[PDB]
Design a protein around this ligand. Structure first.
Ligand code: HEM
Ligand code: HEM
Ligand code: HEM
Ligand code: HEM
Ligand SMILES: [C-]#N
Ligand SMILES: [C-]#N
Ligand SMILES: [C-]#N
Ligand SMILES: [C-]#N
Lengths: 142, 146, 146, 142
């Protein structure tokens, strides 16, 4: 679970990097689909899923808006992300094994874009937080 | 893995440009902070009391450099990785009692530290090749069944 | 894996005594209940509305029996498992879009269903051999890097 | 997270099988050490870690008493298992990757001993519960 120290660390990091949320999301989804090609099928209804796609860019804004929502809802991620859980489990049928994949890709992108801010201490709390986000997104699955 | 020529080129390029003395210490100290149960294997390295101490610890630095040089034998013969690491796998398991999960945690820290150094040059295709290579080494070290 | 003669004997004994028509349906229905996102691949099988319907579903039963017979090719040549399952791996990934994680979840359900049938004959050494065998098949199906 | 349905299911299963907790624990630890030999090192201070050991049998009572505690504390596993978390993380230094291993071995043993009671519906809730136990045991690790 997240301690007060973890919550403060995540909020301070997000304060620093959130200006670039849309770019982070575009890059993280772009990487997930290339490096973990089992994920591409969930986006295949879009007219373009190739590198540089405007559908990936648009969706990246939404994904990191989901992460911003989670930062805002960090004191109770289950309640905060319940609607997104239902969407991924029931409407979209995304296999929940994939949440940790996108979380790793978000960590890689933040490291590429904010190497100064993304210290080991920022990383431990953000990884705990993304684990909590994955668990909350898993809420409606079983 | 049947490596493509492109994968071989990307792995060779990455390791040719890598400063082991910078990346090695950062990867291991990052692992000891993000996954701090791994500190148990380094109790004799001196100060591991807080993040500042671990990052500055020269014994941690030497060991992280060892890890990266330990990847060289895999880079030099990418078609014989499981056999090449059989003795290192035995050392970490029978003598050191390293949990096999810990290899994957350190590999993710190496990837994240390399991503910070390379920045936008750490493209998705670069990440894919580098992670595939580390996954093959991690499987050899952890003695995974295949 | 370098199989021991004992491992080969245990795997042969287990599969010789297994009632595929009992174990197969129970393993797959158990997977569809414990890890219900796997139901997505079987939307055309008829009633999957609740546990009772899934356990009674004859299309699920036929498919679970298929899975177990699918293990026979591995049992018959335990030293060529990755190659033997290359085409099944391509089918489940490129045509069916099965997540590679799902193979491990079903294998654990097969182990738990076999443990219920065998009872105390499902000794630790029996479990070790049977899980090692399934791990090698799971790695081939999931196309794991090694 | 555990729903009211999950909590009721776990309590009803435990009501049925808890009479055999000590035997379940002996068998589950015995299996973990043989099938996942990386775990044996944590018990190697005992004079006997071989199959049939009385130290394994004694420890099995304690492990399943920890599971009984968790059943009793199922509404708030983090608070209920906090002391055991600290013991595993700080005094014993057990790598937290191993909790899911022992959890699988407990499921295998319950299936061998209570095939009638351990239905698929009992298994989904018990697996969710053991995931929660592992997360609570992970509380003091980072
Ligand atoms: C950090 C984890 C994730 C977060 C925060 C997240 C967030 C979101 C958000 C905010 C939406 C938009 C919901 C709406 O339409 O109102 C969405 C949609 C979607 N997500 Fe995720 N998601 C995550 C993980 C994943 C993963 C791992 C996959 C698949 C591999 C996935 C696949 C999808 C798909 C297919 C859609 C619908 C796109 C469309 O509208 O066509 N998500 N997600
Ligand atoms: C990519 C993964 C890794 C590689 C390639 C690797 C490589 C190496 C090498 C090359 C050595 C030196 C062998 C010798 O001194 O003869 C070594 C030693 C050692 N490694 Fe690793 N290692 C890896 C991961 C780990 C992890 C994850 C841990 C701990 C959790 C670890 C703990 C140790 C320890 C404790 C030593 C002993 C050295 C000493 O105390 O002087 N290694 N490793
Ligand atoms: C031990 C793991 C498994 C083995 C050995 C296995 C084996 C098989 C075999 C032998 C077939 C028949 C091929 C054919 O009809 O030509 C098949 C088909 C199929 N399998 Fe699997 N399978 C495994 C796991 C899975 C999992 C985990 C899923 C779903 C999550 C799955 C979904 C399917 C589907 C949807 C079909 C198509 C058959 C139809 O719809 O008629 N399989 N599998
Ligand atoms: C379901 C997960 C687990 C539960 C409920 C659990 C429960 C317990 C309990 C109740 C104790 C006794 C604490 C005391 O001394 O007051 C204990 C001790 C211990 N546990 Fe666990 N444990 C679990 C997982 C593990 C795992 C996965 C390992 C190692 C692979 C482990 C290793 C130990 C050791 C080494 C001790 C100390 C034994 C001694 O007294 O010498 N535990 N555990
Ligand atoms: C969601 N992507
Ligand atoms: C190894 N360090
Ligand atoms: C495949 N069933
Ligand atoms: C604890 N065993």
């Amino acid at each position: 679970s997240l301690s007060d120290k973890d919550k403060a660390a995540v909020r301070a990091l997000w304060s620093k990097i959130g200006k670039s949320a849309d770019a982070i999301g575009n890059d993280a989804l772009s990487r997930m689909i290339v490096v973990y090609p089992q994920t591409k099928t969930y986006f295949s209804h879009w007219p373009d899923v190739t590198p540089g796609s405007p559908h990936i860019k648009a969706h990246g804004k939404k994904v990191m808006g989901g992460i911003a929502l989670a930062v805002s809802k960090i004191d109770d991620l289950k309640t905060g992300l319940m609607e997104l859980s239902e969407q991924h489990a029931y409407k979209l049928r995304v296999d929940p094994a994939n949440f940790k994949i996108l979380n790793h890709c978000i960590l890689v992108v933040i490291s590429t874009m904010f190497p100064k801010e993304f210290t080991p201490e920022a990383h431990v709390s953000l990884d705990k937080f993304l684990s909590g986000v994955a668990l909350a997104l898993a809420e409606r699955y079983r | 893995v049947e490596w493509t020529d492109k994968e071989r080129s990307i792995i060779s390029d990455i390791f040719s440009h890598m400063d082991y003395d910078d990346i090695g210490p950062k990867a291991l100290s990052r692992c000891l902070i993000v996954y701090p149960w791994t500190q148990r294997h380094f109790s004799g390295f001196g100060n591991l009391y807080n993040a500042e101490a671990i990052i500055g610890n020269a014994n941690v630095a030497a060991h992280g450099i060892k890890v990266l040089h330990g990847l060289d034998r895999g880079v030099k013969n990418m078609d014989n990785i499981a056999a090449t690491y059989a003795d290192l796998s035995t050392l970490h398991s029978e003598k050191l009692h390293v949990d096999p999960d810990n290899f994957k945690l350190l590999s993710d820290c190496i990837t994240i530290v390399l991503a910070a150094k390379m920045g936008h040059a750490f493209t998705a295709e670069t990440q894919g090749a580098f992670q595939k290579f580390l996954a093959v080494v991690v499987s050899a070290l952890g003695k995974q069944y295949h």
